[model samples]
Target: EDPPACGSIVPRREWRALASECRERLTRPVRYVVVSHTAGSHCDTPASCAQQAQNVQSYHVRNLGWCDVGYNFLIGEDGLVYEGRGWNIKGAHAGPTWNPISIGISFMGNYMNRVPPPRALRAAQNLLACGVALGALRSNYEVKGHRDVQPTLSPGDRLYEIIQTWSHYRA
Candidate 1:
């Protein structure tokens, strides 16, 4: 798994520090990314997610929501894990069901229409490693799109297919 930015640019030390800081707070194995099927913004690609770097501030997730970012992390089309609601605290990405056990990680663009860039894949993969280090996810935490749990066609058609294409990110 090639980590495009989270580990490479952010540096493993920094990520480790972030994880270590939150380690004590985490309870269950951190379920990695929520990979929302659609974008919160006008449904750009059918398979988009709420981006923290972009909205955590605009939406005031940290201020009003009591969380740093809406989701624990955000992966953009550029393939970067923009820090969101931090690692330790719970996330508001999915409804309550997956929130307690999972840390919501979202994709920035609608992959249902457009394929996730190599960067997105790389960043997501890197996040899986981070999940393991943080003890958030196990060797087999179910990685799925929003539609998997709910009845919406989120994460779109093409993007969902792409999401299922991977074994590591699979449930």
Candidate 2:
């Protein structure tokens, strides 16, 4: 069997991601992790989150002409990680500058008006620790809200504030 992709996270096939055309690879020992939010629908169950993942990929591929869903991974309110480009492939989630050196993970929905449930937050933090464990991420990797590297209200205000207090957050 294929190794666990991201700890206990669901693999891309499980979430029904289209065959990704992303060929570029991010250099290993990634130094940054960019956190974002879909600012759209949220799902709390396997079936709904799977559809949400499909919708995200459809928007990125069909609407934006991206190679695939932008993030390296996506987190659902259901507290499961849905694989995107996975660990090695480059992601289009962040802008060009940050994309090359960072792994991007976007939450399934907007967090401006609310905080993600504790389970969701725990899953994201655990996923980061798993990255470090697998040596895909630098032990000293820095975490940044999407708005930190770009000028936008992404990852939303309340979520942004919570990330600020994380041990790895910078700027």
Candidate 3:
């Protein structure tokens, strides 16, 4: 699984200072992991996902004017983590107020068609574990279907329900 294999988003050298400061600004220990994906997501298999991600980067970055990927992290259908939105910097995925402290992760697929591939789900959990180890979260960290906060039909029916199975479902 491509669990968060990288260290900080910025770089290992910057992590010491950046993480310490991010932790301090945190009003409350980050307890939630916001899960989302592009509304136009089309990758249904690992191979397709890789190609789509390459295409997405070009579109979202070159065409859309975003600095990098739109989400903080992207999960490939191959069950790997694709880094998006560099580390320690605020993410553009969530709206103004929420981006500051929230770690926004988006899986690359439309889960309404089926549950996330087992490998992909596993990778997601492992990433969450990284967040816990960082003290940004408790085991009670929850998975928020993007629609939970903003008015959008994101993390669709099947996917949303499956994510709720986590130990921290509503907590």
Q: Is candidate 1 or candidate 3 better by lDDT?
A: 3
How many clashes does the backbone of model 2 have?
Answer: 0
lDDT digits (tens) for residues 91-166 of candidate 3:
6666766677677787777776666788778777777777676555665666677877777777777778887787
Q: What does the lDDT come to for candidate 2?
A: 0.91
Q: How do all models score by TM-score?
A: 0.69, 0.95, 0.73
The whole-model C-alpha lDDT of candidate 3 against the native structure comes to 0.63
Best by TM-score: 2
Deviation from native of the Cα of residue 131 in model 2, angstroms = 0.2
Weakest lDDT window of 10 consecutive positions for candidate 1? 15-24
Which candidate would rank higher by TM-score, 1 or 3? 3
Q: Write the residue-wise lDDT of candidate 1 on 117-144 in tens digits.
A: 7767787778877677656577677777
Residue ranges of candidate 3 with Cα displaced over 4 Å: 1-29, 41-48, 136-140
Ranking by TM-score: 2, 3, 1
Worst 10 residues of 3 by lDDT: 15-24
Which is better, 2 or 3, measured by lDDT? 2
Enumerate residue pairs that collide in model 2: none
- Local lDDT at 16 for model 1: 31
